[PDB]
């Protein structure tokens, strides 16, 4: 629930995995991933400094 | 192995430091716990073995005891808070629902 | 994480009836169960409990030798039966839900629920 409009067959399954596709060569140096636990929150970032 | 709580019942404006006791009848140690019930629906649990909360609660719920007496308090009152709150032992199998305690606006 | 039932409505006094509890969405095998009974304006009375394997089922005295409890692990269900009522079980029912992960080959303290099932009233 959230995901944009699923176009071909669809199903309300609970899935186990959720995939990401970036472009050639990207990076995602520039931003921050949100986690969510039943005992709390979780974020993944990355930096040098 | 029976309960007795307080305040039975009591209506309070919303944000007050409401607190509510528990009574065993008897030395439980630390096995006791408490739960919210909605009238009309299901309930869930928010504290248990006294001083320790669900993972799903917020640090506002609060409580302790030990022996007979025991208490679960409130930091502030919050409008979603009418509801029930009950207590039960786990010290015998054979076990004790509390006496139930409810909350109320004003 | 998902518990309903079965079964619910209006029954004759001194009837019989099957009542039903289902489960699913969790590791059934390990936890232990109960039911408890909300009439209305009163308390919370507990029914009866059964420890994962099965083995030990216990009852409270307004409950011994009316009602039959029993646990289908295989298809994730609570059965429950019900003789010789009365005018007092005016209730409704939510299947609960032990959070204590005893092994299938034990048995011991259950009484620390997190979760309930959607409450069916029966009234008698
Ligand atoms: C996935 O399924 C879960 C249930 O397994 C859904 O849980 C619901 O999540 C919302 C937040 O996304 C919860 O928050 C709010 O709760 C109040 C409760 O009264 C409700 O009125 C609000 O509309 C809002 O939903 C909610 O408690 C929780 N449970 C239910 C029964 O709705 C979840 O929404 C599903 N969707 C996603 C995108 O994960
Ligand atoms: C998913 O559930 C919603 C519920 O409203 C329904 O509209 C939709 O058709 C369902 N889709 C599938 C594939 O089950
Ligand atoms: C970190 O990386 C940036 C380039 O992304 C660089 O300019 C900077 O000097 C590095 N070091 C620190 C301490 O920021």
Do not use: H
């Not at chain 3, 095998?29 to 029914?47: D, I």
């Not at chain 3, 959070?99 to 099932?117: C, H, I, N, V």
């Amino acid at each position: 629930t959230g995901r944009g409009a699923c176009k071909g067959f669809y199903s309300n399954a609970s899935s186990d995995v959720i995939r990401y596709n970036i472009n050639f060569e990207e990076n995602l140096r520039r931003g921050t991933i949100l986690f969510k636990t039943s005992y709390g929150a979780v974020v993944f970032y990355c930096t040098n400094n | 192995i029976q309960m007795t709580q307080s305040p039975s019942s009591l209506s309070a404006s919303v944000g007050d430091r409401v607190t509510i006791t528990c009574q065993a009848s008897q030395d439980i140690t630390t096995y006791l716990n408490w739960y919210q019930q909605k009238p009309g629906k299901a309930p869930k649990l928010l504290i248990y073995d006294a001083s320790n909360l669900e993972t799903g609660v917020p640090s506002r719920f609060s409580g302790s005891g030990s022996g007979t007496d025991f208490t679960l308090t409130i930091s502030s009152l919050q409008p979603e808070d009418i509801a029930t709150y009950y207590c039960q032992q786990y010290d015998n199998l054979f076990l004790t629902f509390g006496g139930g305690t409810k909350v109320e606006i004003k | 994480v998902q518990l309903v039932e079965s079964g619910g409505g209006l029954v004759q006094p001194g009837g019989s009836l099957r009542l039903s509890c289902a489960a699913s969405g969790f590791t059934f095998s390990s936890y232990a169960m109960s039911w408890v009974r909300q009439a209305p304006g009163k308390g919370l009375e507990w029914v009866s409990a059964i420890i994962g394997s099965g083995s030990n089922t216990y009852y409270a005295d307004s409950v011994k030798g009316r009602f039959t409890i029993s646990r289908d692990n295989a298809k994730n269900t609570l059965y429950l039966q019900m003789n010789s009522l009365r005018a007092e079980d005016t209730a409704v029912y939510y299947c609960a839900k032990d959070t204590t992960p005893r092994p299938l080959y034990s048995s011991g303290w259950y009484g620390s629920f997190d979760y309930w099932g959607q409450g069916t009233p029966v009234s008698v």
